[PDB]
Design a protein around this ligand. Structure first.
Ligand SMILES: Nc1nc2c(ncn2[C@@H]2O[C@H](COP(=O)(O)OP(=O)(O)OP(=O)(O)O)[C@@H](O)[C@H]2O)c(=O)[nH]1
Ligand SMILES: Nc1nc2c(ncn2[C@@H]2O[C@H](COP(=O)(O)OP(=O)(O)OP(=O)(O)O)[C@@H](O)[C@H]2O)c(=O)[nH]1
Ligand SMILES: [Mg+2]
Ligand SMILES: [Mg+2]
Length: 369
């Protein structure tokens, strides 16, 4: 029968969905610049703290003098009690802890969609691009305190926020965050302890709760996804972008996580025949199978995760039910677009899935299927 084809609608890098979703080089460079600012300040803060520790190694300074020294560094941007705590922790170090600290130089690695190239331009007002730049503290396997490390990273991020109008700090359970509302951007800074020189010894720092650390190596997800792209093909990054774009269009705030969409989509494309020469059909195939993937619970590609990426249906409350509803509707949307009574209606319908981003109906062509 006659059908509308959406392959260019999806893939066209001029003004198709890929063209609308991929960051411009100016945006990508802006994110790399922001990343560099954070990394340099974090390096500096640790050097400033280490300078104080060096002074105390040389002579057992009074608490008051150590406090004075702290107040001249970037740590002056923490609260008074936090400054006290930093000075107290430096004061309380024994020779071994201090020697270990003097040998610590933070390292950095970006995780998430900036790293494996699936970061979309944000859609709705309020939505922001994220760059996830982790800070890594090489230490003996378990020697340098959870409290001090978090205070120093917080000092770095808070000192930058104090110097830049329109920057805000947010403490999250798994990271420090700088939000730049006007740039529709935030940078997330998770902190890890790793061995000094094996994913079992990569420990993510948690801010509050019964645990200070949890073993969660972001490299596991990065390698899993990069390997999946190689295995499945160049269309995997594209259809993950498209599913994330659908999520951004259906929910202002909320919806399924990006990682849950990636995991379910990889599962489907590993197991169901599809055709990269028609990403319209491929998206319909993915859409038909996502509800079953999500209803049974979406497993993490990291087997050590304590919970699935999305819960099985007997655990659903209103939010998961809403996500299932939208997932169920998606293949119907795509099917209806395919059989629309005109090109303009085909576009209107498929944009009910991905939002009114693509406006060029010449990317939709009359086909047979
Ligand atoms: N093991 C594990 N890692 C996670 C989980 N959620 C997030 N992460 C890690 O955090 C990184 C960034 O996660 P997100 O910001 O949610 O996802 P993203 O792929 O960057 O997608 P967008 O920011 O929406 O573009 C992932 O690549 C993982 O390394 C999780 O549930 N389990
Ligand atoms: N290694 C690792 N990193 C994670 C994991 N989960 C989240 N992250 C990182 O930490 C950042 C913050 O995660 P979250 O606090 O869960 O984001 P959120 O709770 O949705 O914050 P809001 O957008 O304000 O609702 C993410 O962008 C990831 O980069 C994880 O399980 N493992
Ligand atoms: Mg991210
Ligand atoms: Mg994020």
């Amino acid at each position: 029968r006659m059908t509308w084809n959406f392959h260019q609608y999806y893939t066209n890098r001029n003004d198709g969905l890929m063209g609308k979703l991929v960051l411009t080089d100016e945006e990508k460079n802006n994110l790399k610049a922001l990343r560099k600012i954070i990394r340099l300040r974090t390096r500096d803060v640790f050097e400033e703290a280490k300078g104080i520790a060096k002074a105390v190694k040389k002579s057992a300074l009074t608490f008051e003098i150590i406090q004075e020294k702290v107040s001249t560094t970037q740590i002056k941007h923490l609260s008074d009690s936090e400054q006290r705590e930093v000075a107290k922790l430096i004061y309380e170090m024994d020779d071994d802890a201090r020697d270990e600290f003097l040998g610590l130089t933070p390292r950095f690695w970006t995780q998430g969609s900036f790293q494996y190239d699936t970061l979309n331009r944000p859609f709705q007002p309020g939505q922001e691009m994220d760059i996830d730049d982790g800070t890594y503290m090489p230490m003996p396997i378990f020697k340098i305190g959870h409290s001090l490390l978090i205070l120093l990273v917080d000092a770095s991020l808070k000192s930058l926020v104090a110097e830049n109008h329109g920057w805000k700090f947010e403490a999250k359970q798994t990271c420090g965050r700088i939000k730049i509302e006007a740039e529709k951007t935030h940078i997330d800074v998770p902190m890890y302890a790793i061995p000094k020189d094996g994913s079992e010894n990569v420990n993510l720092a948690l801010r509050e709760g019964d645990r200070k650390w949890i073993n969660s190596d972001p490299k596991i997800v990065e390698d899993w996804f990069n390997d999946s792209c190689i295995r499945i093909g160049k269309h995997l990054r594209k259809v993950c972008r498209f599913m994330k774009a659908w999520r951004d269009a259906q929910w202002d705030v909320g919806g399924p996580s990006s990682i849950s969409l990636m995991a379910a989509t990889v599962n489907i494309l590993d197991s169901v025949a599809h055709d990269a020469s028609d990403l319209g059909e491929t998206m319909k195939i993915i859409a038909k199978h996502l509800p079953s993937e999500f209803a049974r619970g979406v497993e993490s590609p990291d087997s050590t995760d304590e919970k699935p990426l999305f819960p099985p249906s007997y655990k659903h409350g209103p939010r998961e039910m809403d996500i299932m509803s939208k997932l169920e509707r998606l293949p119907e949307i795509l099917s209806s677009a395919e059989s629309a009574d005109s090109k303009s209606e085909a576009l209107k319908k498929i944009n009910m899935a991905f939002g009114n981003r693509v406006t060029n109906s010449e990317l939709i062509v009359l086909a047979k299927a």
